[PDB]
Structure formats: structure tokens, C-alpha cells
Design a protein around this ligand. Structure first.
Ligand code: FES
Ligand SMILES: [K+]
Ligand SMILES: [Mg+2]
Ligand SMILES: [Mg+2]
Ligand SMILES: [Mg+2]
Ligand SMILES: [Mg+2]
Ligand SMILES: [Mg+2]
Ligand SMILES: [Mg+2]
Ligand SMILES: [Mg+2]
Ligand SMILES: [Mg+2]
Ligand SMILES: [Mg+2]
Ligand SMILES: [Mg+2]
Ligand SMILES: [Mg+2]
Ligand SMILES: [Zn+2]
Lengths: 77, 117, 190, 16, 86, 292, 169
RNA sequence: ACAGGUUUGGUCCUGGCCUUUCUAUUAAUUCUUAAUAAAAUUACACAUGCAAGUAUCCGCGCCCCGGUGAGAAUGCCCUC
């Protein structure tokens, strides 16, 4: 792949882009599906985010963690 | 390797020999190569049907939602693969391709019948 | 040779007893090599076309012997009685092509029960045999499943309002493409 | 990471 | 080599002789037979009721070649070669 | 309160029913042989070594669990008619995780018709093996379990190996496991090869099968001919527990006898062919008196 | 090994059969013993036999020897929180010291077995890759799946060379 | 290493070289077809074409992938 400092090609120096044709009925329906699809995934993403917080919090200062900490301390004494 | 930036992504890593593809569901940094170093391997995806006519897919569901929970992006094919399993809703592009197939097939049926008559 | 009907007939025949006797076939065969250490790989094949290549291997020197899964006495001579492992090619001296035939035949024979081999005792796969969990038991149907409605409202095709279509045509004027109606419900077969 | 043969490069800082 | 081999083999000690000079049973633990204590020889005559003194660290002379092979350090290109029949 | 295979009463009866033969249970197998290890032991230490083998034998004699036929799985999680002809094959998704037991894993198949349905037992077990392999399990059904191949092993009195192969390959509650075990139990009954599975851990399975099929005539004759009487009456005692509402069990409450007369109770009450049982028991009695 | 008084103690098995695992809080172990007197028999034999076993299982724990500085042999342990554990041995034998140490600061049997149990899940059997880290290397090593084209050649209908020819024709 | 050849008129001992085994490159002689893997003189000088665009302007990306083993006893593991 090219780098930042190399010069570009000569033949493909005039064109910029050529967007394809747009179907009016199809595009609007597809846009509607994406808007609902992104919203649904975002809620799932936030739901998974809260699950990670719950799992991490229980591993740090969970009830079983205090039981383990007190048991070893009591055994050591 | 030390990269400037990049985002954690779950993608498919190609494998196997020629004419026999085999994708591994893996989670790696976006700026690393396709077959480069990865964090954790999740599952596998066999693209070719076996003697039973089945395309086996493996998913590490509890670990998959762990990486998504911490902010891991998903590529186009993994979302379609997860959409089929039912872990995620059907991708909008999956449905549109289905609808396009029906219309093309309907045109093919009509075109053949018109020539027949 | 008139022995394809029953390959094991030759083993029970008097001709085999007269020549080889109690000892295995490969007992009297010695392989000529370059020195003290024999090469780790024997001849690939000694029956090339219609020409016998020098001193034949124990199997390719008498064509009446057939390598099949039916006969076990012949295949037993190539399997250790105590260790229960298949002898490698240098141990016997057979050519590599027949060695591959022996391995496949022995493996096939063990799959048909014609030859004995070790079967270790295996514990049951699962610790608790419970079918109560919902992974194996049927789950209650979804409210959208019994009704027949799609799982999500946007899965189906809905006709957009005409006002939105006019807006899109104005925005994408010049590069507009022909529109289409609702997709067919069922696709016929060609 | 470091070694005992580190050379104090200065041109890189000068260019920056 | 010939004299050394016969001298060593003629000096071999059997299980029965070992049992007689120790007045204790000798038990063979076959690896493929599991923990089954197979008895191969019994001391004829009086049987000693005193068990052998158990030493925590035995004092035996080991050969460096035997230990090297046991630990998996002999990687020669001649030890594991496939040879002809016996 | 119907009797079950895991009850202590049936287990204790079957533990002493199969006996304990150290020579047969510890048989030198066809594996990579290694040189033996020798050590010196006294008379007291020999008994300690012997009892350790007995404890190991008991653990090695853990009878495999026996259950009934599992119910088929027919569940549809969702239906999608938009994907009727999008793909030709069917996708199988397996949840893999070292912490989740295999009985709780989700195996879901996407049929080409667009229906999200759970995987059947036949394919669920195959998928588990592929991603969680273990020794002795073939992904596809081996040819050895065909009817033609079983007769070849049965002609070679390979009944013990067939049972050990079946438990390793198939799931104990599966349909194939049941029919193979029943076929093996039926064949040994016809040929009277009960001596093969004396010290085998699979002896509990055939004894339980016989006590539920009311076929004890063949087994009782062999035990008497082996001069094993103290355990023979236990099998009759097991029959009464499994079938209390019967004429034979009623006679035991009526007569209230003990010893060999318990067999005589069953011989003249529910035994299909009691002539052989009574004559053999008579043959045992006269022989035992002569020996004593 | 030929040289040495007890060559058996310099093999991998002897170094690996000693089961004394210190807790994560133990850093320094100091052992003082005398080279004369019958009372120091337990201490000297402990140094001569068990110390290599202890160090092998605790590579990160410093072990230092001091001879003929204190008339009464003893062991001193330094914890991470600055706590000092003093163990007095004047008549205890070789075996007694190891059992005494294993209880005051050694790890429990349940802790060791659960530690390695959690380590097993790292090498998950369901993964694919190199033999050193995963069991299988490719999906073709699974019975039923399409085999590798190197071993069994693939049918012509599936070869990409045939697929491209018909598309261009 | 299961070892073998070779000192001497001759034996024993000590002690080198070499044979027998496997992998890679080049060359010689020879050569029918298919599949898969791999493709390697040179950190020497380079003709020509191509390898970074996308996008309603802003912006984002532009040795990241890829390439090489020159340099440095560089390093491996590990703490932060
Ligand atoms: S190694 Fe699996 S396809 Fe070749
Ligand atoms: K020499
Ligand atoms: Mg460049
Ligand atoms: Mg490739
Ligand atoms: Mg750093
Ligand atoms: Mg000389
Ligand atoms: Mg000379
Ligand atoms: Mg060349
Ligand atoms: Mg080619
Ligand atoms: Mg590179
Ligand atoms: Mg170079
Ligand atoms: Mg260099
Ligand atoms: Mg330098
Ligand atoms: Zn041949």
C-alpha cells in the first residue's frame, strides 16, 4: 500500500467519485431499518456494558471477597 | 507492535488452503494484520457444507458479550453471522439482499414464461 | 490367481504351511542396504508395471497373498502381539506401497471387529443427567411467534409516504433510478 | 527498556 | 566384551536367591496390570516380621547417561533410528 | 416410591452379586509395555498392598448409569419467511464455554426455510464432540455397531468389548445405547455366556434388564451350576423388591422361608420353566451333601 | 550424576517431588544452623536435603544461609507487610521442619488444586491454531468436514479455475 | 549410537580422521501428467505502468497492510 509522501498516479488524477443511482422507495425503507437497527444494538451494547460493571464490582468488593479476605487473615493470626 | 491508535474489533481471520476457506472468529486490534496477533479467539466458521449439509459456526457467547460490553466494533460479516444465530436482530442489509433476490427471481420467472408463450 | 473368493484359503492351505511354516512371512527376508544403519524409508514399490525390481518384499514376492480385511492370520503377523502396535516398514522390509495397504487393511479390520485391540474404560460424558434445563426442553412460544407476525415490525415491507418519495427524488435528481413495489411474498421455481 | 550504551540523540529533538 | 558379558550374566542374582537372603516376599508391580501386587517368589523357611528400614533419600550410584535419557535430554540422530528385525 | 438403580439396597445386592476376581479385573492390556518395578514387602505389608487393589477395584467397578429413552426435542424459537431461499445449507450454532456444563449448552440450527429451531439429540451430540473432543468417541457412527458386525464380535465372545465401546461412543440415555445394550443382553441370554460378565462392571446392567423383563430362568440356572448360592438367593430377593405385587412375592410373605427355599418359591410360582430350576437345585443339594 | 555424596538429589524428579508452596506474602527466608553438635542434626539435614526442593517451587523467594552465628538453629521468615515469623528448631528432625513450615505459611491443598483448575481453561479445546497452543490446526482435521485439498484433491466443480472458465464463457 | 573402517611384523591400551542416518541450496545427467506447499544472490543502480482514497465542500485515513535483515550483542522473560 502507498505511503503519505509518495506522489499519486497520473491517469487517475482527474476523477474524484461517481456515486451510484438511488432507488427512492428502496433507500427510504433501508434508511428506516438502519435507524431502528442501530438503536436496538445500542441498547444491547449498554446492557452488556452494565453487565461488565456488575461482574467487575463483584470481583473487587463482593461479599465472597470479604469472606475470603477475613478467612485468610483469621487463619494467619 | 506499537500502533498510533485503532479500535478493538471482532472480525473473521482467513485460514486453510486454496479453494478451502476457513474463517476464525477472533478479536484483535484494528491496525494489526488479518492473521496477526490477537487478544482472544472466540469461535470458528466453516464456509463449506459437510456430508450432512451443515455449515458449522462456533460462538463464545459469554465472552462475545464481554468484548462488546467494553466497546468492541463488529465488521459486516460477523453481524450477519450473529444475526442468523439470533444473538442480534437481522441485519438490514441481510433483508434487502433477500428482497433483491426475490425480485430478480420473479423477473427471471416472468422472463422465461414470456419467451415460452 | 484363483484365491480372490477367499484370501484366507491360502493361509490354511498346505502350500503356505510347507514353505513358511510357523514363523511369519518376513522372518527369512533380509533387506540389502548401504551399511550398518538401514535407510529409514524402504522401496516405494517393487512391482512397477510388469517388472519385478530385484529382491522382492515378502508380500510382493508371492502374488497369491492378498491384503484384505477378511484374513486375520496374515495381518496378525504384521502386528505386535504384546505391544499391539503396527510394525513400521524397516522392521519387516515390505515396500512402502504395501505398507500403506497393510495399515489401511489393519485399521479397517479393527473397525469391523475382526482383530482385537485395546479398549480403555471410559467414564460417562456428563456428571448429572438432567433434561429439566431450558436448553433441551421446549421454551414457551413468543407472543409474536404464535400470531405469525414477524419478530420485528421493520422486518416486513412498508410502503413509504408519497411526500418522502418526492423529497428523495428532488435530493437525488439526475442520478435517480427506477423504483420498485413490494417484493413478492413467495419465489417460484424455474 | 534501556541499555548501558545509550547515545544521547539531539537532532531529533532539534527537528521537532 | 565376550568375557565381560558372560562374567556379568553368570553373576546375575535371581528373585529366589534374593528372597532367601532377605527372608522377605518380593512383589512385582506390573505397569499394565495396575496396582495388583503379583507375588513371584516366596522366602522358603522362616519369614522375617521386621520390615525393611525405609530411607527417605536412598544412597545409590546413578549413571549420568541414564538420568539424561530419563529427563529427555538425549537428542542424538542415532538413538531413535528405525532398524531392521532382530 | 418405585425402585431405582441408584438405591443403596439394589446397589449393595449387585455389589456382592458380581463378585470380585482380582485376576480378571486387572488383565494385562495390549498397550505400550514397560519394565516392571520390584520391591520387598513383609507379610503385613502384602495384605496392605492387597486391600489397596481391592479399593481400586471397587472404584474401577462403578456401574454405568442406566436411564430410559430421552424425549425428542422439537422446539422452534422463531420463524423468518423472508429468508426462504437465501441459502441452501443450514447453519448450526454451538455455545462453547469451559464453565457451562454440556447439558445446558444451546445448540440452535437455522434451517434454509428460515426457522430458528433447536438441534435434535442426534446432531447435538455430534456438535459437542467436534468442539469438545475426547478419547474413544467417533464423530460419525462407526460401522462396528451395525447388526452384521455385532454378530462377528458376538461369535468371538466380544460381549464385554461391545458394551465398553457402546458407553464410550453413545450417550447412556440415547436410543442407540439402549438398543445395543438390549441386543447384547438378549444374545448372551440365548448363548448362556453369563460367565463373561462376572467381574465386569457391566454386570449390573444385564441383571437390572433381566429383573425388568421377568427373564431370570437362564441366569439362575448358571449361578447354581457355578456353585454360587449365597448370591443366587439375593437375585431372587431383588426380584421381590422390583415386583412386589406378584404371586411369588406373596408366597415369600406367606411361607416366610429362608435360604434355598426362596428359590423354590420362585421356581414353582412364576418361573416359566421351573423343571430345570428345581432339578438343578436338587442336583446342587445332593452334590453339596456328598461334598460336606 | 556420578559426583557428589547423594547424586539422586540433583535430578529433576527430586527437585519436583518437594511440595512446599509459600504464600504470595513470603519473600525472604533466613536459615541459621550450626555445623557441630547433635542438636543441629535436623537443621543440617534440612539444608542438605529439603532446601533445593523448597527453592525450586519458589523461584521468587530469596533463600540465604548463615552458619555458626547463633548457638540455637532457627528459621526466620520475612513477609510483605514487614511481619517476621520465627521458627525454632533445636531437636526437630528433617521431616518435622517441613511439616511445620507447610502449615504456618504453606498453601492449602484445596488452593493448589483450584489454582491449576482455573489454568486449564486457558487452553480451551474449542480453539484452532498452532500445535503448541491448540490441538487442531485446521477444520479439515475434523471427520466429516471437507478434507484439505493437499491430501484428497477437490472435485472440479468446486475448483475456482473451473468456476472462472464458465463465467467467462 | 547397537556401532563400523584405519596406527603395528604382532597383541593390548590411549587417541584423531572417515563411513553408515535426516533436511536445504546450487551444479551435473535425466524428465510424462495432475494437485497442494514454497519460491531465497545482492540495504547495489533503476526505464515504464500500477500499489490511498473516501465524502454534499469540513473532515478522516494515507509503510496501517505490505517489504527487508542493513544495523545493534543487540535481547528473552518480567514489574510499572
Ligand atoms: S490444512 Fe486444512 S485445508 Fe489444508
Ligand atoms: K575408532
Ligand atoms: Mg516507498
Ligand atoms: Mg494460503
Ligand atoms: Mg513498556
Ligand atoms: Mg604405534
Ligand atoms: Mg600394515
Ligand atoms: Mg537449477
Ligand atoms: Mg502446477
Ligand atoms: Mg514483517
Ligand atoms: Mg543475506
Ligand atoms: Mg548483518
Ligand atoms: Mg558492534
Ligand atoms: Zn512389494
Amino acid at each position: 500500500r502507498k505511503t503519505r509522501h509518495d506522489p499519486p498516479a497520473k491517469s487517475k488524477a482527474g476523477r474524484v467519485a461517481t456515486p451510484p443511482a438511488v432507488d427512492p422507495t428502496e433507500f427510504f425503507v433501508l434508511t428506516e431499518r438502519y435507524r431502528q437497527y442501530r438503536q436496538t444494538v445500542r441498547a444491547l451494547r449498554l446492557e452488556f456494558m452494565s453487565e461488565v460493571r456488575k461482574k467487575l464490582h463483584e470481583a473487587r468488593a463482593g461479599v465472597q471477597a470479604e469472606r475470603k479476605a477475613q478467612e485468610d487473615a483469621a487463619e494467619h493470626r | 507492535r506499537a500502533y498510533r491508535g485503532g479500535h478493538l474489533t471482532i472480525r473473521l481471520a482467513l485460514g486453510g488452503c486454496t479453494n478451502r476457506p476457513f474463517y476464525r472468529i477472533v478479536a484483535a486490534h484494528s491496525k494489526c494484520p488479518r492473521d496477526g496477533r490477537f487478544v482472544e479467539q472466540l469461535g470458528s466458521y466453516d464456509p463449506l457444507p459437510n456430508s450432512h449439509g451443515e455449515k458449522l459456526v462456533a460462538l463464545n457467547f459469554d465472552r462475545i458479550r464481554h468484548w462488546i460490553g467494553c466497546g468492541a466494533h463488529l465488521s459486516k460479516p460477523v453481524e450477519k453471522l450473529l444475526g442468523l444465530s439470533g444473538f442480534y436482530p437481522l441485519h438490514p442489509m441481510m433483508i434487502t439482499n433477500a428482497e433483491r433476490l426475490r425480485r430478480k427471481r420473479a423477473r427471471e420467472v416472468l422472463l422465461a414464461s414470456q419467451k415460452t408463450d | 490367481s484363483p484365491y480372490k473368493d477367499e484370501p484366507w484359503k491360502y493361509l490354511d492351505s498346505e502350500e503356505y504351511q510347507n514353505r513358511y511354516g510357523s514363523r511369519p512371512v518376513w522372518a527369512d527376508y533380509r533387506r540389502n542396504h548401504k551399511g550398518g544403519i538401514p535407510p529409514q524409508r524402504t522401496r516405494k514399490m517393487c512391482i512397477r508395471g510388469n517388472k519385478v525390481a530385484g529382491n522382492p518384499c515378502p508380500i510382493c514376492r508371492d502374488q497369491k497373498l492378498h491384503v484384505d480385511f477378511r484374513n486375520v492370520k496374515l495381518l496378525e503377523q504384521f502386528v505386535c502381539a504384546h505391544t499391539g502396535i503396527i510394525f513400521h516398514a524397516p522392521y519387516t522390509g515390505v515396500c512402502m506401497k504395501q505398507h500403506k495397504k497393510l495399515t489401511q487393511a489393519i485399521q479397517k479390520a479393527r473397525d469391523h471387529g475382526l482383530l482385537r485391540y485395546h479398549i480403555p474404560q471410559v467414564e460417562p460424558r456428563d456428571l448429572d443427567f438432567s433434561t429439566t434445563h431450558g436448553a433441551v426442553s421446549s421454551t414457551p412460544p413468543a407472543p409474536t411467534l404464535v400470531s405469525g407476525d414477524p419478530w420485528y415490525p421493520w422486518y416486513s415491507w412498508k410502503q413509504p409516504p408519497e411526500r418522502e418519495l418526492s423529497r428523495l427524488r428532488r435530493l437525488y435528481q439526475g442520478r435517480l433510478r427506477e423504483e420498485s413495489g413490494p417484493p413478492p411474498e413467495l419465489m417460484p421455481e424455474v | 527498556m534501556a541499555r548501558k550504551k545509550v547515545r544521547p540523540r539531539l537532532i531529533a529533538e532539534l527537528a521537532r | 566384551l565376550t568375557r565381560g558379558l558372560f562374567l556379568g550374566l553368570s553373576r546375575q542374582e535371581t528373585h529366589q536367591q534374593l528372597a532367601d537372603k532377605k527372608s522377605l516376599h518380593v512383589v512385582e508391580f506390573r505397569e499394565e496390570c495396575g496396582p495388583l501386587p503379583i507375588v513371584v517368589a516366596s522366602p522358603q523357611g522362616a519369614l522375617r516380621k521386621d520390615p525393611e528400614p525405609e530411607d527417605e533419600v536412598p544412597d545409590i550410584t546413578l549413571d549420568w547417561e541414564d538420568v539424561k535419557a530419563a529427563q529427555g535430554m538425549k537428542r542424538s540422530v542415532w538413538s531413535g533410528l528405525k532398524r531392521a528385525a532382530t | 416410591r418405585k425402585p431405582t438403580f441408584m438405591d443403596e439396597e439394589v446397589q449393595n445386592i449387585l455389589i456382592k452379586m458380581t463378585g470380585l476376581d482380582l485376576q480378571k479385573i486387572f488383565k494385562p492390556a495390549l498397550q505400550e509395555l514397560k519394565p516392571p518395578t520390584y520391591k520387598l514387602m513383609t507379610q503385613a505389608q502384602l495384605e496392605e498392598a492387597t486391600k489397596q487393589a481391592v479399593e481400586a477395584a471397587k472404584v474401577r467397578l462403578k456401574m454405568p448409569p442406566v436411564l430410559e429413552e430421552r424425549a425428542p426435542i422439537n422446539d422452534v424459537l422463531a420463524e423468518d419467511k423472508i429468508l426462504e431461499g437465501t441459502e441452501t445449507a443450514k447453519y448450526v450454532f454451538t455455545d462453547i464455554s469451559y464453565s457451562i456444563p454440556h447439558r445446558e449448552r444451546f445448540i440452535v440450527v437455522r434451517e434454509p426455510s428460515g426457522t430458528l429451531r433447536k438441534a435434535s439429540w442426534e446432531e447435538r451430540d455430534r456438535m459437542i464432540q467436534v468442539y469438545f473432543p475426547r478419547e474413544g468417541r467417533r464423530i460419525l457412527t462407526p460401522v462396528i455397531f451395525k447388526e452384521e458386525n455385532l454378530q462377528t464380535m458376538y461369535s468371538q465372545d466380544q460381549h464385554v468389548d461391545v458394551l465398553n465401546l457402546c458407553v464410550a461412543q453413545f450417550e447412556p440415555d440415547s436410543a442407540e445405547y439402549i438398543k445395543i445394550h438390549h441386543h447384547t443382553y438378549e444374545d448372551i441370554d440365548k448363548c448362556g455366556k453369563y460367565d463373561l460378565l462376572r467381574s465386569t462392571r457391566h454386570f449390573g446392567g444385564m441383571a437390572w434388564y433381566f429383573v425388568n423383563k421377568k427373564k431370570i430362568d437362564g441366569l439362575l440356572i448358571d449361578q447354581i451350576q457355578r456353585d454360587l448360592v449365597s448370591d443366587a438367593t439375593s437375585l431372587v430377593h431383588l426380584y421381590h423388591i422390583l415386583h412386589p405385587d406378584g404371586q411369588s412375592a406373596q408366597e415369600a410373605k406367606k411361607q416366610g422361608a429362608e435360604g434355598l427355599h426362596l428359590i423354590k418359591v420362585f421356581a414353582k410360582t412364576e418361573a416359566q420353566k421351573g423343571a430345570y430350576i428345581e432339578l438343578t437345585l436338587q442336583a446342587y443339594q445332593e452334590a453339596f451333601i456328598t461334598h460336606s | 550424576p556420578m559426583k557428589g555424596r547423594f547424586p539422586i538429589r540433583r535430578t529433576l524428579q527430586y527437585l519436583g517431588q518437594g511440595d512446599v508452596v509459600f504464600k504470595d506474602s513470603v519473600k525472604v527466608m533466613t536459615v541459621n544452623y550450626n555445623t557441630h553438635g547433635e542438636l543441629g542434626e535436623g537443621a543440617r539435614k534440612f539444608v542438605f536435603f529439603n532446601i533445593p526442593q523448597i527453592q525450586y517451587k519458589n523461584p521468587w523467594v530469596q533463600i540465604t544461609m548463615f552458619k555458626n552465628m547463633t548457638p540455637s538453629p532457627f528459621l526466620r521468615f520475612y513477609l510483605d507487610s514487614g511481619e517476621q515469623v520465627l521458627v525454632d528448631v533445636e531437636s526437630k528432625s528433617n521431616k518435622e521442619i517441613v511439616e511445620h513450615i507447610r502449615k504456618i505459611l504453606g498453601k492449602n491443598e484445596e488452593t493448589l488444586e483450584k489454582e491449576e483448575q482455573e489454568k486449564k481453561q486457558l487452553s480451551h479445546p474449542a480453539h484452532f491454531g498452532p500445535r503448541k497452543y491448540c490441538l487442531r490446526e485446521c477444520m479439515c482435521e475434523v471427520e466429516g468436514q471437507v478434507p484439505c485439498p493437499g491430501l484428497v484433491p477437490l472435485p472440479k466443480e468446486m475448483t475456482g479455475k473451473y468456476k472462472a472458465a464458465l463465467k467467462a464463457t
